[PDB]
Design a protein around this ligand. Structure first.
Ligand SMILES: CC1=N[C@H](C(=O)O)[C@@H](O)CN1
Ligand SMILES: CC1=N[C@H](C(=O)O)[C@@H](O)CN1
Ligand SMILES: O=C(O)CCC(=O)C(=O)O
Ligand SMILES: O=C(O)CCC(=O)C(=O)O
Ligand SMILES: [Fe+3]
Ligand SMILES: [Fe+3]
Lengths: 282, 282
């Protein structure tokens, strides 16, 4: 029942992936092009530009701006500072609190791609606004999102993806998301990946740090190795994260101990199919 | 006496540069092109690529890893290590402690450009060899070299430049040095520059981060605002740092209190000129 055991041996292994990456047959009636599906297959991520209008983008940026400026109105449980601070690092369940964000996640232009790639109905496993403050923004060391979702939340299979919607401009200077392309086809066991292994992957695959204007979307497979550096620039980097999970891939018990995990980190346990909203955002 | 007062008020000022940036008239005798010289004037830095042969590059790389591997053989005060291990991170006065580095700093391809740009005979105010490992590389916040060299060392005029000779590859990803071009014409008073000022400079000049294969040289005016982000990548940062000061501009007493500063951070007091060296490094 555990296809992806981790944190059990005193060594790390590079286990082979035992799941599809794209879980659908591609055809003309798909939300992305055949080349785009093959890219995701091969690289474990793709980038979508100009899929929202500037009115849509502008509306979005204020939704995030407003949530991040009145943090006494939202669940105190769902706020992450840089602990020794009170500058915000993330805000969880933003699909659950902000209506604007809820409407975003349910939009066809995101969810249909999510359903095509996962070949199933989808639901939000998790959401976050990773506001990366200028001057004092701290990094996110390398990790496979799936390796925590699996051991800690009990996500059984590789059938999920993240969508990062950029709300500030991501230049190469304010700590954008870096990925190791192709790393999604290796399951690297551990709770933090080991330097020697990481070194092997990045050598084998190099590193990409996709940039883009606000409204650009980065979609990466749940098992892609990724991270980011800190941000000392005056430019904040606020990026909404949406984790789509296939409903077939509902959470069983955590394939580890410390079971279970806080409610906003991971949605348990019986999901309803997302209702896909076709339209703009006003 | 003091043209550049700093650390003497609770309010920082942005004061104007009262020195030239390029101290010489350009002709066809200059070791750089007229557009390069104009670019240094305007931007505060330029980048020389391919001035060293690959053999010469491999030679410097071999000598620097040698020096970094052998702390026994070097002055103990001029060493910096990691507060958890005995890994070297810096060696000061390498222009002194290493004959190779002493020959790099006297090479015409480097010293003649300083002599032109500074319009005087030069000498090493400070040299360094830096190894910044991957994975755990630390940030290094914004600051003008000249501000500390003025207040703490007694450098009286803006008549110095820094040369960073890349010994490992700097991609956009491994925390490469960042500069705010044009900020060398503004003297930001204070010993850390404040955020609002830094934001102002970055908003009006933007941020650039010169990358390059090893052997690439980055030259920058002493008062150019710079800094770097952290480095989680598996790719180390390594460089030879060389500060050329014009002999005309030798250190007086500090324009602050805490007089003075350790020998290996700033060469007092009546230095001789450097002797340029033409020819290969092997
Ligand atoms: C809940 C969550 N866990 C992973 C982690 O803890 O690194 C991350 O990849 C993202 N979100
Ligand atoms: C000793 C030295 N100090 C500056 C600094 O640490 O802020 C750097 O800009 C250059 N060299
Ligand atoms: O935005 C970041 O740099 C963190 C990305 C990440 O690993 C996540 O929380 O999904
Ligand atoms: O100190 C650092 O590492 C930032 C780069 C720099 O200013 C230097 O070391 O010369
Ligand atoms: Fe993540
Ligand atoms: Fe510096």
């Amino acid at each position: 029942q555990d296809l992806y055991p981790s944190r059990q041996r005193a060594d790390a292994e590079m286990r082979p992936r035992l799941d599809p990456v794209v879980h659908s047959e591609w055809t003309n009636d798909a939300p992305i092009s055949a080349r785009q599906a093959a890219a995701f297959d091969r690289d474990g991520y793709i980038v979508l530009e100009d899929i929202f209008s500037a009115d849509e983008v502008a509306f979005l940026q204020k939704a995030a701006g407003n949530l991040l400026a009145d943090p006494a109105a939202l669940d105190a449980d769902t706020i992450v500072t840089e602990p020794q601070s009170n500058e915000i690092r993330s805000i969880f369940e933003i699909h659950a609190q902000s209506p604007v964000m809820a409407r975003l996640a349910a939009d066809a232009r995101l969810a249909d791609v999510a359903r095509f790639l996962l070949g199933d109905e989808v639901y939000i496993h998790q959401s976050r606004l990773n506001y990366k403050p200028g001057f004092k923004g701290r990094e996110f060391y390398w990790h496979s999102d799936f390796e925590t979702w699996h051991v800690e939340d009990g996500m059984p299979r590789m059938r999920a993806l993240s969508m990062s919607v950029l709300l500030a401009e991501n230049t190469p200077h304010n700590g954008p998301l870096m990925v190791i392309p192709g790393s999604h086809r290796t399951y690297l066991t551990c709770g933090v990946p080991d330097e020697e292994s990481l070194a092997e992957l990045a050598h084998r695959h190099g590193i990409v740090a996709p940039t883009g204007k606000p409204g650009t979307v980065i979609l990466f497979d749940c098992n892609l190795m990724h991270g980011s550096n800190g941000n000392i620039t005056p430019f904040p980097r606020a990026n909404a994260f949406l984790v789509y999970n296939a409903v077939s891939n509902r959470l069983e018990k955590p394939f580890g101990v410390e079971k279970p995990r806080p409610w906003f980190l991971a949605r348990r346990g019986e999901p309803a199919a997302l209702r896909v909203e076709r339209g703009p955002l006003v």
